[PDB]
Every structure is written in C-alpha cells, then in structure tokens.
Design a binder for this molecule. Sequence first.
Ligand SMILES: Nc1nc2[nH]cnc2c(=O)[nH]1
Ligand SMILES: Nc1nc2[nH]cnc2c(=O)[nH]1
Lengths: 338, 338
Amino acid sequence: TIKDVAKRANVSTTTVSHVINKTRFVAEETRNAVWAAIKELHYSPSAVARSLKVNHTKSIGLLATSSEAAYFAEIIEAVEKNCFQKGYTLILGNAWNNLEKQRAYLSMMAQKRVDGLLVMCSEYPEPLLAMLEEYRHIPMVVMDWGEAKADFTDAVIDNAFEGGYMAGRYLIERGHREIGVIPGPLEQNTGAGRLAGFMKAMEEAMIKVPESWIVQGDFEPESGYRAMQQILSQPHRPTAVFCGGDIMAMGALCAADEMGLRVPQDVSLIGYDNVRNARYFTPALTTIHQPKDSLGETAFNMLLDRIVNKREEPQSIEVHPRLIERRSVADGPFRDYR
Amino acid sequence: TIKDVAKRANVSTTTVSHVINKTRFVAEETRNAVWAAIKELHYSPSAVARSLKVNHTKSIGLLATSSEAAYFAEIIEAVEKNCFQKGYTLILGNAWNNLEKQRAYLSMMAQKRVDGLLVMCSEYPEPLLAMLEEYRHIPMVVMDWGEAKADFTDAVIDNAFEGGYMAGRYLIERGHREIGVIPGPLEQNTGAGRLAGFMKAMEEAMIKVPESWIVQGDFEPESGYRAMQQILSQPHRPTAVFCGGDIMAMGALCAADEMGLRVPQDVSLIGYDNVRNARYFTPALTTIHQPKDSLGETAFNMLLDRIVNKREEPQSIEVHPRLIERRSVADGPFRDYR
DNA sequence: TACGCAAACGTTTGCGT
DNA sequence: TACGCAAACGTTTGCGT
Ligand SMILES: Nc1nc2[nH]cnc2c(=O)[nH]1
Ligand SMILES: Nc1nc2[nH]cnc2c(=O)[nH]1
C-alpha cells in the first residue's frame, strides 16, 4: 500500500504519489528513495483505488455478437491494438444476439464503469435500441450500422450497399446474366444492405432473378454449403453466384466440389469480406474487401474523442470497400457482346 | 449514488445496500421503496467502489498471443462464455510474443487487479518465466504448455506429443512411407511437441525423412503455402505430408492446387487442430482434433477453484486429441502390403 | 424486529507553509 | 524550495439498539 511505501520511504504518501505520477517536482533523493522501496516493497498501485478517485477506468467495453467468426475476430483484434497503443483496457463480451444476454453485459458494463462503449450487436430491434439509450450517459458508438439508427450514438458506416453494387457490376461486365445469391440475414446491415446494393445493378441491367436462385445464409460456412447445394440442384442453374460472405463462400466452394462442378470453370463465386485468409481459399477468392482495420481504428478513435474531448453531438463516418480480383470468377457467356 | 438513493428512500444507505445485495432481511415496504428510487433515480452501483471494499474485481485477465488465428479465437471465445456464465469479466490482451508487450499487459493486469490470470504466450523464454513469477501472488494458469514448466502456476496439458504420434501412424497404416512435414515453430509446444510425436512413429517404423522434406511453418496460411510449394518443387517428392496446423494445411492445400497436383489423388494432407471450419476446406480436411472448448473451460475452472477455494498447490490437467477422418488422405503405395 | 452509525478500503489533491 | 495534512471518492460491514 501507498501508506506502506511512504512509511518505508519516511515520506508522506502525497509524496509517494507525486513520484508515481510525476505530477509535481520531487527532489532526486526523495525520488530515488521512494522508488527503491517501491521496488523492494513490491508495490502495484491499485487502479481501482485511483479510478474511484479520478472518475475514469481507462478501459473500454466491447458488446460484440460473437468472437470466432473471421469477420468479427479481425475487427476485435483491430480494436485491441488501438486500445493498447492508446493506454486502454479491452473488455470483451459477446451477446449472441441475445437480448437478455446483452442487457446483462451492458449491465455489468456500466457497473465496472467502462469509460466508453463499442457496439456490434448485428440485429437492433426496438427492444435493443431501447436498452442502449438508457446508457446514453456512457459514451459509445455502434460500428455495424447501415445508417445512423440513433441520435444518441456515433457510427461508422460501411457503404455496404455500394459494395453489394460493385459485386453485381463485376459479374455483369464479366459476361454473366444468370446470377444467383446467397445473402446474409436480412435483419443485418451486411445482410440486407449488401443484397440491396447487388440488386440495384441487376435491375439497372434488366436482370431478373428467380427465387429458386436466392437462398438465405447466416454467414456460417455450413449455410453457404446448403445454399450452393440447393442452387445447382435445380434443372436450370445460374452461371455465377454472389455470396453474402467470405466464410459462406468458403462453404459454397466446398459443396460445388463435392458437386463435381468446377470453379470457376463451372460456377463463378464472388464473395464479400476479404478475410485475412480468403486469398488462400481453393481456389483463390475474388471478393469485395471491407476495411476491417479502419472500421476498427476509426471506431476506437471516435470514442476517445467523444471521451476526452467531452464531445456531445452524435457523429457517423463512412468507410469504403473495393473489389479484389482473385480466381473464383471467369468471363460469362455474354462478355464479347458489349 | 447510494447516498442519493437512501435519501430519496428516506432510509440509511446501509439499507440501500442490504437490499441491493440481499445481504440481510428488509421489510417489503422499505424494500420496494428503495427499488423505486433505485429505478427512478436510475442507479448503477459502482463496481469499482464495491471492489475497493471487497478485495476482488470479479474479472479475469487473458494474456494471449493473438486473437485472430482460428486456433486462438476459438479458445478465447470458449473462455468468455465460461467467464460470463460464472459471473466474470473478460479482459483480453494480446502480447504478440513481445516481452515488452507482455510485461505491460501483465502490468496493467495487476493494476486493474484481475482476480485471476489466464496465459497463452506461446514462447516462454527465461525472461518471460521470470516476469510471470513476480505475479505468483495473483492466481493464474498457463494453458498452452507441453508439460508443467513452472511450480507457481496451473496447467492444462494437451498431450500434443500423443497427437503428433497419432498423425504419423495414420499415414503409415494408409500405405505411406514417404511423408513430409511442415511443422509449427519449435519454440512452441504445438510446434515442437507435435513434430516430436510424429517423429517417434517414423522411427518406430524405420521411416527416415530427408531434410528437404521438412519445412518450418508459423501457423500462417502463407507459410503452409511456401512449404508445400518448396516440398513438391524438388525432383523426388513425398506422397503425404503432415501439416503442423489446419490453417497452414489450408495454405498448403492452395499451393498444390496452383501446383496442378491433385489432393488427395496426388498428395495426402493430414493437418492438426480441427478448426471450426476445416470440414469445409476443399477438400474436406482429415485432421487431428484438439479439445479447444475443454482446453478453455478446464482452464477457467482451475482458476476459479484456485481463486474461490484459495488453492495454493500447483496443478496440471491433461486433455486429449483424436483423429478426424475427412478427405485429404488416400491409401499409400504400401497399403495392401501389411 | 427492523434498521442506522460510523469506520474502512487505497488512492488523489487543494491548501498550505 | 520541497514537501505534508486532511478530506474525498462510493461502497460494505461490525456493532449496536
Ligand atoms: N460471420 C459474419 N460475417 C459477417 N460479414 C459481415 N457481417 C458479418 C456478420 O455479422 N457475421
Ligand atoms: N495460429 C496458431 N495455430 C496454432 N495451433 C496450435 N498452436 C497454435 C498457435 O500458437 N498458433
């Protein structure tokens, strides 16, 4: 305890502190002396004590959805550096889209008194929106929203509609007119948003799409498997499918193999995410890339700012995606005709 | 503040507390009354205050190596549930095998006063071992050690040597006598340990292995790529390779493709990890599976026990791996001869 | 029976001199 | 010049009555 180091140090605690935090000038002797005792006495200042005083834990919370999915894990890993190089402590908590679950992690959140709050709950029902607001006191920012759903938070928008668009365009220019689509859950942004972007181009190109060629996915490889399966299992099949996510595409890739179909010789897959190891998919995945890092870093920053600069007004910064050409896509049967 | 709810509640704080923690009987009126104010006044008890008093933060720290690699992310995700269903708060911090880095996260660790400590630093040099010990006060347990490296911690041993063994045996019985190997870093347990297991069987079967058929990997898909590449790029090539890790195998799978070689028609790949989505590799990955969940859950538990049961003696629980047959492996040219 | 007092936990910090 | 006092932060808890 400080009372213990000051003692061994034959100096006031006020002194022990002033040297611990270089908050005011202290003679060299006194300085050194404190230190020695600090070391021999083996002192570890109590952050909890210091925070009960200074009104800030210096730790930010993460109300995530899950932490194993490649997509998530990369953002999550991104944040942590940011937290660390800026002095913060990361508190991770996955709600699994569970209201109860979130209401709890949110609960312990404020209790432990997180200086700030990063959110990625995926689905945002009225109930959620509700609970979230009752903590509008604690600074926060949702990082996975299509557009600014609330006025009480900060947001980083991905322009995922623009991405869904970019993907379809590619297919078109490639020669395809018979595309399919295994989208991510519609309650989601990266779900509906991407699909909706992809579908503008279609109409923009008078391309229709039979319902039998559009199957819901949940970002789980198993789901990609089942869809791709469902797709090619019907008499008339498309020549190129737009896969809602990379790890789903990764799963759709598998099925086509066991299918006996070649890729991209038989099917053309265009994903979306650009996961750390999508380049090494087999084959190499052509895909849309989301700036996961910046989506992360940008978030942490807005928080700090709102924090340290006692910001009060909400905000929302956009981020942008870009096509990444790999090997899952070939020319369509209309390429030369354009 | 409590002083604020008790006031609005026209009752002593001692009362406000006794109802907040059901620590002693309180009349219904008084009870209800407190509550109302608790709600209208919108009170969030201060955990930091309560902990500065009760001597326990109710939060455990995670001094990980990294959090994006599938292997890690799965354990990490495992822990968090365990933490959550048992009432704890997860603090995540990746040291990136950086001494300085770890010494820091370890530093802030004790400061914030983690009730317990989970470790997975991969490489454990004397320097590390040193620093770690100076916190032997704070309860902990390394979860990625070959054998009990220290007497001041708890350990969960994976029997990764037994796994490396299981893998080689498979190859043998399959018909192979010309195997290769892309192992994970030797400073590691899952590195050296697995390799060393795999190599006993070899000798146990009078199988030698040309150095030109053994290439260091770092668990990174890119590394698997380069090795597999290096391997088949030499005049005489093996008929089956044992891949140190799944995500590396995943990377070796790619190269062979671009190689023009078929798998398992041309090469036979046997990985090790059994990652959440290795089944969906292309082809479906035959591999050794580590009980990631239990490796996680078991760890959290030992910690609690050491914690709540004020345990003092070190411990070490083993966990076991098992072969998972998929599609990356075919009979060798010696199968019928046995 | 049902509750209230004050002291304590481990720090920081405004006055001082 | 260089340092020391005491009060405060937001709770819990042993005596009480
Ligand atoms: N698994 C997963 N992948 C995604 N890609 C974009 N959004 C998501 C998401 O919420 N989950
Ligand atoms: N990436 C990675 N994979 C592993 N598989 C077993 N151990 C490890 C490790 O330390 N890192």
